[PDB]
Design a protein around this ligand. Structure first.
Ligand code: HEM
Ligand SMILES: O=C(O)c1ccc(-c2ccsc2)cc1
Ligand SMILES: [Cl-]
Length: 393
């Protein structure tokens, strides 16, 4: 009653062009079985949204990667928020929600917008730039580590640790195993910076340690919570920003609309998060036998959610393969949905908005002038290189 498919969603062939295989997954049925890794798969919007919003049946405490924590040991101590279920998840989630609150955004918006304007001006002086290394990567590195309160030394570990974390959500393929092989230096840097003395006052990390006085987290819980903000946030925002630039270059009509109304910058980034979905997939584990879309799934089974596919499901979106900066994007699952829906989504939207705004006001044309190269990751979708010409407005 369940179609069995041989598609490997963690193969380089799939990473190169996942959209045809995603339709095959959506059109085979609401629930598929992937014989390659012995997991259930859901690629339609309705089933992805259903799973994300039933955390009791589809839990996260047994890991949101392929590995089942009841069967194998986690490659690192489990995150206190991503890899936790209610009620254990609730109080750590509330701390990160207050640390990255709408009120917190007010204290950092002017500095984030200034660095974005300054980077665009710098790149306009060069003309031909790599929109990944020089823009998508450079800008978040120039605002987020300082907003965390991280010292200057050792910041070169942040990007490799981010790519390791998301590679480790995948199956034990070469991408995952080679990432873990090289992980020891990045783990040691990240864990050390999580200690309260190493986090500058006023920053995100120091604000997490300050919540230990309230009874929501204990002092021994703070370093792991800080670790969450050194694991998530970086590569997703880089990939999302890089995808928005790529879209603005592939769809010149949308850049012209953004230039004419720079207040569309926020929705232009949100639509890029839907169009690209920097986080393509992750897992849940069933805690009981469950019927999902006419399919009986046993207890203790891994369920693979295709976020990017759900964001392009024609059963939910009109013209999903088109980048439309005025699209009603509310309801996309690029940030997830339910109790685990990205706690840093306000930081990501701010970073994306102020960068697209700086582009909207200072740039007249964005033209690809070189070979585009993909960056391969078991969980993340994004570009390795995007050579573009920036024409000043
Ligand atoms: C374009 C940018 C981003 C995307 C696409 C993204 C994506 C996601 C998704 C899909 C989830 C849900 C995971 C799940 O349900 O299992 C999530 C959770 C999370 N994200 Fe993001 N994220 C982004 C930016 C950020 C930023 C900037 C931060 C921190 C500053 C961050 C930190 C977190 C954390 C800590 C969680 C776990 C929340 C929880 O378990 O309740 N993310 N993210
Ligand atoms: O270290 C953490 O707490 C953490 C790590 C990864 C994610 C994430 C985001 C989209 S898929 C998985 C969330 C939180
Ligand atoms: Cl670690």
């Amino acid at each position: 009653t369940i179609p069995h498919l041989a598609i490997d969603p963690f193969s380089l062939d799939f990473f190169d062009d996942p959209y045809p295989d995603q339709q095959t997954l959506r059109d085979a049925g609401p629930v598929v079985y992937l014989d390659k890794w012995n997991v259930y798969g859901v690629a339609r919007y309705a089933e992805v949204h259903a799973v994300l919003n039933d955390p009791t049946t589809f839990c996260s405490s047994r890991g949101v990667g392929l590995s089942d924590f009841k069967k194998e040991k986690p490659w690192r101590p489990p995150s206190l928020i991503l890899e936790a279920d209610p009620p254990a998840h609730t109080r750590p989630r509330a701390v990160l929600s207050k640390v990255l609150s709408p009120a917190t955004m007010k204290t950092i918006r002017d500095g984030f917008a200034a660095a974005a304007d300054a980077k665009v001006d710098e790149l306009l002086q060069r003309g031909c730039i790599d929109a990944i290394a020089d823009l998508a990567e450079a800008y978040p590195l120039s605002v987020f580590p300082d907003a965390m309160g991280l010292k200057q030394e050792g910041r070169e570990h942040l990007l490799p640790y981010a790519g390791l974390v998301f590679n480790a959500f995948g199956p034990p393929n070469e991408l995952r195993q080679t990432a873990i092989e090289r992980s020891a230096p990045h783990q040691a840097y990240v864990n050390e910076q999580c200690q309260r003395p190493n986090l500058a006052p006023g920053g995100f990390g120091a604000c997490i340690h300050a919540f230990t006085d309230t009874g929501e987290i204990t002092p021994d819980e703070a370093p792991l919570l800080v670790r969450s903000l050194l694991s998530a946030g970086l590569d997703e925002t880089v990939n999302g920003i890089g995808a928005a630039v790529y879209c603005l270059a592939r769809f010149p009509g949308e850049l012209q609309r953004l230039r004419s109304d720079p207040t569309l910058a926020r929705n232009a980034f949100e639509e890029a998060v839907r169009f690209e979905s920097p986080v393509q997939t992750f897992f849940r584990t069933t805690t009981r036998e469950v019927e999902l879309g006419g399919a009986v799934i046993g207890e203790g089974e891994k369920v693979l959610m295709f976020l990017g596919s759900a964001n392009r499901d024609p059963r939910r979106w009109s013209d999903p393969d088109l980048y439309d900066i005025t699209r009603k994007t509310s309801g996309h699952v690029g940030f997830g949905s339910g109790v685990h829906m990205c706690v840093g989504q306000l930081v990501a939207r701010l970073e994306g908005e102020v960068m697209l705004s700086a582009l909207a006001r200072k740039v007249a044309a964005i033209d690809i002038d070189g070979p585009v190269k993909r960056r391969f990751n078991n969980t993340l979708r994004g570009l390795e290189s995007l050579p573009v010409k920036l024409t000043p407005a």
